[PDB]
């Protein structure tokens with residue numbers, strides 16, 4: 001049947017889950033970084049630890065974001081292609097502070113150039 | 123906290139959903155897959171005519187799976203090669219696997235991620 005998901009459904013499915021992965025890529029070598037994230041107005045907000053390779057690999061680079069969930073009947077997944085941008089604006093920073101993330105430190109947003117979703121049938 | 127190999131391979135057995143990550147010329151793709159662990163290998167089934175087939179099989183792939191509660195979480199990353207199951211012993215082991223069933227296609231295409239490296243981390247959020 002139909003398994004392609006729409007944008008409004010993709011962004012809300014991402015909010016049902018607290019854990020996703022950043023995927024960075026250089027030439028033919030890629031890295032994956034599990035992150036705790038929240039969705040804010042079609043952006044993927046997460047917080048990054050200083051001096052870690054996630055900061056260097058992602059910030060101001062093209063990245064992949066992925067999150068998924070499943071039950072015994074069906075599963076879904078959402079992929080965001082975009083760019084990781086440091087939260088550096090006053091209004092950007094105030095919005096990031098309203099985020100109910102899991103319990104100095106830098107905020108980062110994945111700004112989407114495309115978002116896609118699939119549902120998988122078991 | 124860095125995790126040993128024996129913790130990673132067991133932690134992988136605690137969850138049924140992981141992701142294959144394939145890479146070609148500065149552009150990655152990611153494929154969520156239902157999987158089980160069999161003798162330090164990552165077993166999964168592939169749907170025919172799918173892009174996962176062309177992208178992962180016989181190429182170097184990343185495999186990742188994770189989990190978390192309110193306090194802490196973990197993740198495991200496997201670097202290896204995806205190879206199809208082409209052997210009566212391998213085939214017999216793959217058919218005992220506790221994998222989620224899907225659809226009326228009795229078409230089977232067993233693939234294993236043969237690990238070249240496995241690593242794991244524990245994370246706290248503090």
Ligand SMILES: Cc1cc2nc3c(=O)[nH]c(=O)nc-3n(C[C@H](O)[C@H](O)[C@H](O)COP(=O)(O)OP(=O)(O)OC[C@H]3O[C@@H](n4cnc5c(N)ncnc54)[C@H](O)[C@@H]3O)c2cc1C
Pocket residue numbers: 032033034035036037046047048049051052053054055188189190194195196197198199241242243244245
């Ligand atoms: C459940 C969970 C949630 C996390 N949430 C966040 C978050 O919200 N924000 C954040 O900034 N970071 C988070 N992390 C950490 C992040 O995913 C990476 O572990 C980290 O960015 C790696 O930085 P590093 O400099 O220590 O890597 P390095 O030490 O330079 O990495 C060396 C090698 O270790 C391996 N490795 C590194 N990290 C992992 C990993 N997580 N799992 C498996 N192998 C790994 C890779 O093979 C890598 O090549 C989380 C990790 C986990 C497990």
Ligand SMILES: Cc1cc2nc3c(=O)[nH]c(=O)nc-3n(C[C@H](O)[C@H](O)[C@H](O)COP(=O)(O)OP(=O)(O)OC[C@H]3O[C@@H](n4cnc5c(N)ncnc54)[C@H](O)[C@@H]3O)c2cc1C
Pocket residue numbers: 068069070074075076077078079116117118119120139152153154155156157166167168169171172173174175
């Ligand atoms: C929960 C879950 C479990 C799955 N388990 C398995 C499994 O065990 N075995 C298996 O063979 N397949 C599994 N799949 C499907 C697997 O991800 C497909 O191989 C993948 O969708 C690519 O198939 P395709 O050739 O039709 O994609 P294409 O048509 O080649 O993809 C075109 C574009 O669609 C987008 N896209 C593709 N797949 C996804 C996705 N999953 N989420 C978001 N965007 C996507 C990408 O942007 C991609 O560039 C699962 C999917 C989900 C959601």
Ligand SMILES: [Cl-]
Pocket residue numbers: none
């Ligand atoms: Cl400015």
